[PDB]
Amino acid sequence: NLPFLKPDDIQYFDKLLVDVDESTLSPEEQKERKIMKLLLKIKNGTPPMRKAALRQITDKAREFGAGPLFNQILPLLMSPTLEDQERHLLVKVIDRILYKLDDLVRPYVHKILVVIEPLLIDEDYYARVEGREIISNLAKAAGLATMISTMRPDIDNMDEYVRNTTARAFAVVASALGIPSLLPFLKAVCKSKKSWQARHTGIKIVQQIAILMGCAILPHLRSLVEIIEHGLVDEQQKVRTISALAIAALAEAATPYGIESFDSVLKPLWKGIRQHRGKGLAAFLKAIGYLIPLMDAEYANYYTREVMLILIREFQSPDEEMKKIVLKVVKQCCGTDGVEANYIKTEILPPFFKHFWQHRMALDRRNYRQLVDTTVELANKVGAAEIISRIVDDLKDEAEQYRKMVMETIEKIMGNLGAADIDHKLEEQLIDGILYAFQEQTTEDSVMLNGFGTVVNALGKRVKPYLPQICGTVLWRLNNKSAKVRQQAADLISRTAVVMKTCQEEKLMGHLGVVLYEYLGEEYPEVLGSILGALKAIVNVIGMHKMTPPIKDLLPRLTPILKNRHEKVQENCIDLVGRIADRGAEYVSAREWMRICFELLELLKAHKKAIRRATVNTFGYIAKAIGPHDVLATLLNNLKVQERQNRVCTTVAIAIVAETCSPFTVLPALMNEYRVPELNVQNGVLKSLSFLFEYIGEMGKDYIYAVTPLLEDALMDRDLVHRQTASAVVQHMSLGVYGFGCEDSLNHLLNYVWPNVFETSPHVIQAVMGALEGLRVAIGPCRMLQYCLQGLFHPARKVRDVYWKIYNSIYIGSQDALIAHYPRIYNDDKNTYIRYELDYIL
Amino acid sequence: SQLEHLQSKYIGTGHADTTKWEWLVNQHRDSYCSYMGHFDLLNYFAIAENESKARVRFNLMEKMLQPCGPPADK
Amino acid sequence: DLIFCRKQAGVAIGRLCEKCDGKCVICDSYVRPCTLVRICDECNYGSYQGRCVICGGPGVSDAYYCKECTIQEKDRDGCPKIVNLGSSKTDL
Amino acid sequence: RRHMFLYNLTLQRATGISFAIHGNFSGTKQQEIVVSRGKILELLRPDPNTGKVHTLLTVEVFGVIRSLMAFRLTGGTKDYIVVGSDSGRIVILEYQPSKNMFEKIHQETFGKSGCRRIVPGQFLAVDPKGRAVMISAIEKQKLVYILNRDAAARLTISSPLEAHKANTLVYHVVGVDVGFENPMFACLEMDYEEADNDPTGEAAANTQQTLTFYELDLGLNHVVRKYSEPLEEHGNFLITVPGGSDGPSGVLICSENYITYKNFGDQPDIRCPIPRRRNDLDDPERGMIFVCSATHKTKSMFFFLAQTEQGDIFKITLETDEDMVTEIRLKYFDTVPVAAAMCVLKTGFLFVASEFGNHYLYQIAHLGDDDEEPEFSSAMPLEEGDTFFFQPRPLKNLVLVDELDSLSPILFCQIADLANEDTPQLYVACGRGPRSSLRVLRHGVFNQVAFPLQYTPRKFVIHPESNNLIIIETDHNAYTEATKAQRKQQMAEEMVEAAGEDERELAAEMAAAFLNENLPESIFGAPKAGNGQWASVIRVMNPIQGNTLDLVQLEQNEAAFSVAVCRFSNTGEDWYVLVGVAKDLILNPRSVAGGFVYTYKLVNNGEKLEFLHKTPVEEVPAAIAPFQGRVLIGVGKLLRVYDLGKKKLLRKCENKHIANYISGIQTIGHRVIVSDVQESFIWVRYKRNENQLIIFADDTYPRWVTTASLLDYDTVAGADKFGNICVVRLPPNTNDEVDSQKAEVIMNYHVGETVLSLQKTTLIPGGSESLVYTTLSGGIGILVPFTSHEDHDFFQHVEMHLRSEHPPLCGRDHLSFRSYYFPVKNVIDGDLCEQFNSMEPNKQKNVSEELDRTPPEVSKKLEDIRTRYA
Ligand SMILES: *C[C@]1(O)C[C@@](C)(OC)O[C@H](/C=C/C(C)=C/C[C@@H]2O[C@H](C)[C@H](NC(=O)/C=C\[C@H](C)OC(C)=O)C[C@@H]2C)[C@H]1O
Ligand SMILES: [Zn+2]
Ligand SMILES: [Zn+2]
Ligand SMILES: [Zn+2]
């Protein structure tokens, strides 16, 4: 039938609503109606409808012609109400029909371009991708000649944005047909005697080719540079600027290769910056800054020494774009081998820090980010302390944004290089600065948190003398009226607990733990989670015997926090309880651990896997601590008294007990639970066994015989659910013990799994086939093939169907191994079936 | 969320109407490709005969077109 | 009806939403993730990138094949992004 | 007793080479060679000063390397290594000289494991500019990966692009040097769809090979079968012709008796026949193909080196007018053993990786264009089937610089102290054809001494009294010495019957000259006799020196396969040598006229073979085992107890119920273990009172057994053709008089190489016992039993941790690789555990305290097993 029509689809598919006779209309009207039906089935249809309609519109593309096809496609493609994936579908349609239409699209190239090329400036990245895609498919369908003929008249257009659009289109055409195809046209255009606009457009085409194609331009980098190099001395200023920018783009695309191809440009730029001012000088400097990291050490030293005077002069330029370009250039040239560290120290660093490191630059995001990254990269070469000491005092400036900038810079530098370069004076300066910055916080800056943390962790045991005042400020902020300050303080505690331990200040740690324990009634969940994390850090650093509060008081306080609904509280409290159960279950009775287990059972079905993992770990620790018998008895009782919703929680807990305290403490009672003639209890036992073996894996290698009789009973039981679950257990066993020598027990169980291959219920035969695949893995494909060969050519068609399904699974799984396992099939009167090579004996 | 269509599209699988000739042709083609993969199998075969490894590979590739002879009509 | 895409997977890493975090897309097991899931390029294009390989919603974690699936090389069967053959591109 | 738990260790790594590529893997001007020994990736560095090849790196990849190439991107100075194997994954590695390791840069997954038919991995082809790489299966499936760089000049890989075609077989794939145009891949293909639907069978005879050019359009991001033309001569491989501004950018298709230049477009095909040897002693019905090729590019020229089936290398250059090729020019270069790969280094050296035996490094002294040896060309005219001629001669353009020892292939081995050196020596039957040898290996890595032999050695037995070796050397497609001399004489006489009276003075002394020349088959190769023709001799040789104490040459088309030295109870202490040989044996399809068992008397302190008599048998006598004063002989299916009569060997007792064919016979007490060619081991009970041979036990699995060794009265260890080792055992108190019993497989392991010798011994006196095996790739390995279960658990945990943290280099799963044909059982891979030293310190320490030890203790515990060896 006809796919559903949304309101915005009416204007485009209204003709399909009127039930015309379809033998009355024009052949052109018939063409239009068929194209409309195909486009509707593509845009609104199901995947099969889309596939069929796409195939048919591709096969009928030449019959339809490029005229009607694009006449209907272009309004749909540029529909303001069109969705992104619908646009992608239409772009794929355009690609297919273009590939099939080839040169028949030539008369419509201009109109296709005028309609679509607004996509190349769209905010959506994928919209620009699809615009370039359409242009490249059009260029390869129509050919270079007609693309040039169509787009040439706008090369010297008076409007600059028309020229920019044409330049981007020509860059995409060059990416489609290759740079050598456009090389002579560009060579002619960039040197056009008629107007500077044409030269500007050609050089911009070269720049856009660089930006679009990246490192793929390297084979033709020399040709592009030779084509555009004259523009640097052009009489028109805009041509010089676009030539420098194109050189910069080519250098960026060629990084880190191709420095030789720029030789003829080195002297012009070097001279141009000694004459030009403004944006032309900025473009020349940008080109130089992208060229320098491509040079070898000696010439790099020479060239940046030649340009450094102009660079340091422009350090004080008022125009912000010039300052951004100059910052990029200092970052680039100082990051180049050959520019010595002492030269940067003496010549570059003082003016850089005097003119760029001012509180004005911290109020703009771009300047902030660029100066931070540049200063960190500078410290990477010239030394951490050398840069940190030049801004450390500004850590106490009253401008909070400036403080944030300095703190982020120091944080990154010390996280990259450490504190081995920092002496005592700068160490105390850092301590005082980070203390002041953390105290004078009005916005709860995560940058201050990260800076404090990394500074303390890099100082290491050297912060030992400052830990009194640090923990004093931490306790002060822990009692702040606003809970977010408390959360930040607890996070800082967790971040620095390790270093605080290696400093041997356990009394302050104990007081911090006491304060955090007093805050466990925090009503705000994120704050409570951070407090629990800080308490876990303090417990991990102090130990279980000397912890304050004592563990015997701490864990029962944590028991009711397990029912909190916030996932952060859940994860943190579960991890804390888990470490307590791992290394300090001494101080907790078995009954309290049973209460914890009861609260923990429900969190095994959480959606977040981190919470499930923490619950598994902690439950395993508790089972190891208290032993299996009591918890296993509780779990088996639960298994009998509840239905699916919490039965799988109990199954997972039983498997955890069996994995932690070994399965011979669980399997006897679990299998004894199977003797109850209530059937559903037997199904629960079977599901528990399935998950137990899937969970314990290799550990199950010693327990196949132990559960073999029950599996014999269940695989032959009247209930097909029993058979299905027993086959699942067999699958999990064989996959879990794969490669551990259980071939004979699994071979025995295979004889009980096999007769169910003729079961008709899909849920049953699916489990049987899964068990058979696991058994192929564990026993080997040869045994499975031996079972298969009897029914591969059985007279009954049903037997052949079953055995060929099994053979297909084995063959797909074990194609190369079967070569050694195929049986000897003798020749007949017509064909040779002997593999004589395998009968060779040296 | 399932079906055997892609199993049908894998070369070498079969069905209830698969003939003996097709099964053994698949076996022989698989075996020849395996010999050309497992280096020591081809070493054995090239030592048994007195041929270079390249000659053995060429012969096995030429045998892949009809390894079991022409098929039957019915 | 839902099926598997099963196209030749590429470099894109499949993702799961918050509802199925940690599940194996082939066998539905939560036990022992093993190998990163790879998906076809068409299933990761545009607004579909980083989306759940089951529902198309926001992805919050990397999708994995379970240990049993990688043992059986069920990680080598193609893009496991679930396709709804009864829906259209803008449905649900 | 509890089932044995074994620890596997390679003592001597495989030395055969299947692939060798050369490049700048260090990133400097130094040129290295990456070779694949099969399951081992090795990095060699030839020194231009001394001309000696040093091995830099050796890595067990625990897979089957099937394709190995090098590539580089525009502007780079280091060659990356691309490997395709049996892992269903393609990997790209980069050698790091600072740490001496293969860093895996990329690993991309596309299909299932194994050496499969339709899953790619067998073939690799790279765009000469390093922009794309195609990995190909033999049938149907091909995949293309786009390669690029990022900002930090780090290699990036794309999703795979498909280029499949059903019912299409692939002979070879090679990238075309189309300059910087769209990348192109040329493949030899053949479509079998027509042959599979023609019951008449001549659609198969009319089916012809195709040369197909696939084009990767980078902009449109797809691959299209753009060109494809049939060929008259089916090709065996392709060679990249340099392109862009460096050459015409076609493909050189090598075929039987021809080499053709082809290129899509208006370029015509240029054919040139391969120059054959003048007075070639081979079978005249045999064609000629190239076995390998090398391409060297200079600033001024480019040339190729193509080696024949007989070891003769031809230098191939292409003459070019306009941008088409005018002709193909060839010239006889030199003659070196048949190679699987050749590498021309820019320093002036040629590396020859022989397909069997030792490898070589020669110095290119002269390019061979300033002598009066004739040049051949496609332009030259021949009519009919004349095909040019040349005469081989000793080395003129190359001189031998280095010889790399390699035991590949090993067909038989015996560990014994025949030199009274206290510690036993390893006596190994290595080599193939005229380059076969017997080598003695001593522990101290093994020091080797080689003694040359004539044909391929099949078995050898040690005389208990004389301690000498009695070797049987056999070869298919081979002439006897008498037949060779007779053919030489006859072809000289037919030389001078033909031609004219004009100057017999010339021809009669040319023929004489031709008969005075004896080109050593060790260098130029033995003449190929043709199908069903065999050459075989028996050799009594001293094991300390290399002297052939005696040699007996057998009839033409008589092929020795079994040899035994024994005594008989009806005779006294006289030693006898029995040699079983086949007569008129053809391998494919198999048939035979019968066989003969030669009985010689060993006289003169085991130095002379005195022919006693010869007994005919209705099938190949493939196994001969002494058995309490009589012999056990396998005549195909039949197992027979024979006694020595003074005119023939008399059949004393027989069992005729073995499945297919008896490859081996071993005895302990009155239990005889018979190896079937396909059906594993069969236990037969000889009841001496009733004089009967009864089968009482067999296996539950088929097994293509190659060798076996009796562990005890119930336990048999064996190896198969598919690179597996098994240990099977009869259940306790298995009655030898009941009907049916089944052996239990108590051990399974995939070695990765085909094992042909397996022996329980102690290689060091004062150490415990172990199982030593040898392989066809020249490897020597050991299986060592575990004493404690604590050590067993420790090493098992080590293996399990290494499987996760140090996965096989080429993408394979280690557990799956060791479970190639049967699931691994009761063996731990020590070659994997010993890679603990090759890990980074953090991994070492993490998994060391996973074991709760220091990495020193771990590595010392690993080395202690290697020093104790049992
Ligand atoms: C993709 C989905 O199918 C989508 C949706 C809406 O399907 C109905 O939601 C599914 C989520 C199901 C959940 C969260 C079920 C809870 C189950 O809880 C039992 C107790 C099991 N728990 C575990 O196996 C727990 C821990 C395991 C041993 O370890 C780890 C690390 O997971 C399984 C379920 C989680 C969603 O899948
Ligand atoms: Zn997909
Ligand atoms: Zn989802
Ligand atoms: Zn799974």
Numbering used by the authors:
A (entry chain C): 463 to 1304
B (entry chain B): 9 to 82
C (entry chain D): 7 to 98
D (entry chain A): -2 to 441, 773 to 1198
Paper passage:
We have engineered a variant of the human SF3B core that lacks the β-propeller BPB domain of SF3B3 (SF3BΔBPB). The complex formed crystals in two alternative space-groups, belonging to the orthorhombic and trigonal symmetry systems. Our best orthorhombic crystals diffracted X-rays to a resolution of 2.3 Å, while diffraction data for the trigonal form was limited to ~3.0 Å. The distal half of the SSA molecule (C11-C15) establishes hydrophobic contacts and hydrogen bonds with the hinged pocket. The proximal half of SSA (atoms C1–C10) extends away from the tunnel towards one of the zinc fingers of PHF5A (i.e., Znf1). Its epoxy-tetrahydropyran group is recognized by a hydrogen bond network, involving SF3B1 and PHF5A residues and several solvent molecules in the binding pocket. Strikingly, SSA’s epoxide group resides close to C26-PHF5A—one of the four cysteine residues of PHF5A’s Znf1 zinc cluster. The electron density is continuous between C26-PHF5A and the epoxide group, while absent between C26-PHF5A and Znf1’s zinc ion, indicating an intermolecular covalent bond between SSA and C26-PHF5A. Notably, a thiocyanate ion replaces the water molecule at Znf1 in the orthorhombic SF3BΔBPB-crystals that grow in 200 mM potassium thiocyanate. The 2.3 Å resolution of these crystals enables visualization of thiocyanate’s distinctive elongated shape next to the zinc atom.
Splicing modulators alter the splicing patterns in cells by binding to the U2 snRNP (small nuclear ribonucleoprotein)—a complex chaperoning the selection of branch and 3′ splice sites. The U2 snRNP has a bipartite organization, exhibiting a smaller U2 3′ module and a larger U2 5′ module. The latter contains the heptameric SF3B complex, whose core subunit SF3B1 is recurrently mutated in cancers. In this work, by employing FR901464 analogs as molecular tools to dissect the splicing pathway, we elucidate how spliceostatins/sudemycins interfere with prespliceosome assembly and splicing commitment by covalent coupling to a reactive zinc finger of PHF5A.
